[PDB]
Scaffold this active site. Structure first.
Site, PDB file in Angstrom:
ATOM      1  N   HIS A 286      -3.537  -4.409  -8.310  1.00  0.00           N
ATOM      2  CA  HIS A 286      -3.587  -5.333  -9.420  1.00  0.00           C
ATOM      3  C   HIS A 286      -3.309  -6.535  -8.716  1.00  0.00           C
ATOM      4  CE1 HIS A 286       0.480  -3.806  -8.890  1.00  0.00           C
ATOM      5  NE2 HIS A 286       0.829  -4.871  -9.369  1.00  0.00           N
TER       6      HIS A 286
ATOM      7  N   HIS B  33      -1.172 -10.111 -10.177  1.00  0.00           N
ATOM      8  CA  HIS B  33      -0.273 -10.706 -11.379  1.00  0.00           C
ATOM      9  C   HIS B  33      -0.849 -12.291 -11.301  1.00  0.00           C
ATOM     10  CE1 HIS B  33       2.862  -7.643 -11.227  1.00  0.00           C
ATOM     11  NE2 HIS B  33       2.379  -7.313  -9.831  1.00  0.00           N
TER      12      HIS B  33
ATOM     13  N   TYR C 241       0.940   0.913  -4.039  1.00  0.00           N
ATOM     14  CA  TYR C 241       2.184   0.980  -3.656  1.00  0.00           C
ATOM     15  C   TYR C 241       3.136   1.869  -4.477  1.00  0.00           C
ATOM     16  CZ  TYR C 241       2.943  -2.778  -6.902  1.00  0.00           C
ATOM     17  OH  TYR C 241       2.998  -3.605  -7.970  1.00  0.00           O
TER      18      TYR C 241
ATOM     19  N   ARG D 115       1.325   2.458  -8.065  1.00  0.00           N
ATOM     20  CA  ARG D 115       0.492   1.699  -8.931  1.00  0.00           C
ATOM     21  C   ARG D 115      -0.784   1.665  -8.580  1.00  0.00           C
ATOM     22  NH1 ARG D 115       1.868  -3.214 -12.152  1.00  0.00           N
ATOM     23  NH2 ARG D 115       0.268  -2.176 -12.912  1.00  0.00           N
TER      24      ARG D 115
ATOM     25  N   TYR E 159       4.416  -6.843  -0.813  1.00  0.00           N
ATOM     26  CA  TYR E 159       4.415  -8.125  -1.117  1.00  0.00           C
ATOM     27  C   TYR E 159       5.285  -9.018  -0.282  1.00  0.00           C
ATOM     28  CZ  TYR E 159       3.161  -7.019  -5.945  1.00  0.00           C
ATOM     29  OH  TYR E 159       2.258  -6.582  -7.090  1.00  0.00           O
TER      30      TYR E 159
HETATM   31 FE   LIG Z   1       2.626  -5.570  -8.571  1.00  0.00          FE
END
Ligand SMILES: [Fe+3]
Ligand SMILES: [Fe+3]
Lengths: 170, 173
Positions: free
Chosen positions: B115, B117, B98, B112, B69
């Site tokens: 995805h 958000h 990640y 994970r 991120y």
């Molecule tokens: Fe996330």
């Protein structure tokens, strides 16, 4: 971080209001919606994180066993307060089916399946308008709005104890 | 009257925020979330009656292809405005997986699945916090939050186009 967070619970679906909602239903401290009630609905009000919604109120209305709503008063209407753990309980009759076609509409007419209408409130904020349904009930197969995810669970062989947990968005 | 009333659409489910949200993401009039974006997400924002929610805003953030991120700025973050018919579209990358384990955990670390958000807004009212998922992606089978009802639908797969319709709860009058 991510690792700690439980999976969210799916939200209870909404449903149409219908034409028979009436504001002003009394608080029912004993949960009894009508004279001669023998059917109990109980459950919890939770949010999407699975936390209890303390003090939530269910604003409930339904038809009688003949499929008629009280348009003049509050028989089979009431506000039911959930407790500090989000648990609710109310006492009623099995609602009857009713015709929603115009009288002169051709045969067959459309009949609604048995259902209970519920608004969930937290103080002055409405959190949900929905309907609850019953399993293996007349017209479930054709009713436009019947939803298997909002069928109450049978808690006993007798058919007089039913449970349903609400999941509302805070 | 009952007769003509529509059947409601199921609500898009909520999901966890996670630890990487950042408020104040800029509006993106072109819908471009990063330089070099190759993947398009599009769809509509509807309410529970199926009516369009014109002008709803998607507040989007995701990891880059490496699973990282942007913790300094607003790369791969942005506010995307739905139009008068409730239609949105934005351009991004396929987010990477990640690690959500600490290295203290033994080598079977946990990742994970990919995805995106999304928060849905109407003016300053937040209507939904959720996540969108992808079909047949790595770790879908084990991810704690993956939900098949929020998997995007392949529109093309050649233009790398994906579709999803949000259904948010609004006050009906
Ligand atoms: Fe996330
Ligand atoms: Fe009704």
């Amino acid at each position: 971080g991510y690792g700690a967070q439980p999976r969210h619970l799916p939200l209870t679906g909404t449903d149409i209001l219908g034409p028979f909602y009436r504001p002003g239903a009394p608080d029912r401290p004993d949960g009894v919606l009508c004279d001669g009630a023998t059917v109990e609905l109980n459950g919890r009000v939770l949010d999407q994180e699975g936390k209890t919604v303390s003090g939530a109120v269910l604003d409930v209305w339904q038809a009688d066993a003949e499929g008629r709503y009280d348009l003049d008063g509050y028989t089979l209407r009431g506000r039911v307060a959930a407790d500090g753990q989000g648990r609710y309980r109310f006492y009623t009759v099995m609602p009857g089916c009713y015709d929603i076609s115009e009288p002169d509409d051709p045969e067959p007419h459309r009949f609604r399946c048995p259902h209970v209408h519920v608004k969930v409130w937290m103080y002055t904020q409405e959190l949900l308008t929905t309907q609850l349904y019953f399993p293996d009930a007349e017209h479930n197969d054709t009713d436009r709005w019947f939803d298997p995810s909002r069928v109450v669970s049978c808690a006993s062989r007798s058919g007089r104890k039913w449970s349903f947990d609400f999941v509302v968005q805070r």
